[PDB]
Design a protein around this ligand. Sequence first.
Ligand SMILES: Nc1nc2c(ncn2[C@@H]2O[C@H](COP(=O)(O)OP(=O)(O)NP(=O)(O)O)[C@@H](O)[C@H]2O)c(=O)[nH]1
Ligand SMILES: [Mg+2]
Length: 166
Amino acid sequence: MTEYKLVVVGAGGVGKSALTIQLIQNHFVDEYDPTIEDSYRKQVVIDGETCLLDILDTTGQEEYSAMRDQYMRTGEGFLCVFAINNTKSFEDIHQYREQIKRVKDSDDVPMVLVGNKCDLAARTVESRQAQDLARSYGIPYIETSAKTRQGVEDAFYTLVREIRQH
Ligand SMILES: Nc1nc2c(ncn2[C@@H]2O[C@H](COP(=O)(O)OP(=O)(O)NP(=O)(O)O)[C@@H](O)[C@H]2O)c(=O)[nH]1
Ligand SMILES: [Mg+2]
């Protein structure tokens, strides 16, 4: 069947795993559990199409920046995740976007900019400036909460549709 190779990238602790685990396992992991590299394959139906989501849940640890190239080449679509209460993770987005572009020899890679943790009231990244960023990349901006599940399916399914339109 059609498979979509999705990759979730971003600074440590933004909720990359929490987002993936909500989507695949319908619950919120509220605990400390840094990722090395986890893969999730799940058969779903999206807009009537039987397909396989092949999701790579990556690490934010900057020491492994050199090992990102290999999985970025293979990924068809990318969630670039920051947390709306972590300004540094939003500044870090640019470095992820640029490495993906460099490694993919592409400046129109399927990609969604994801503002996660939108359940938290203590926001430090205004939605408008994240939206301004996504507009300058030419990609959708979606806010999510892995805790409440708000926007989660939206972010992943939009990414799949970005791949279908590429
Ligand atoms: N309130 C709230 N907390 C969240 C949300 N997503 C993740 N968290 C919490 O934030 C922490 C980090 O989440 P995690 O998913 O492990 O982050 P990560 O980006 O995978 N980290 P790593 O890069 O090390 O693998 C955890 O305590 C998690 O429960 C969210 O949407 N809302
Ligand atoms: Mg993780």
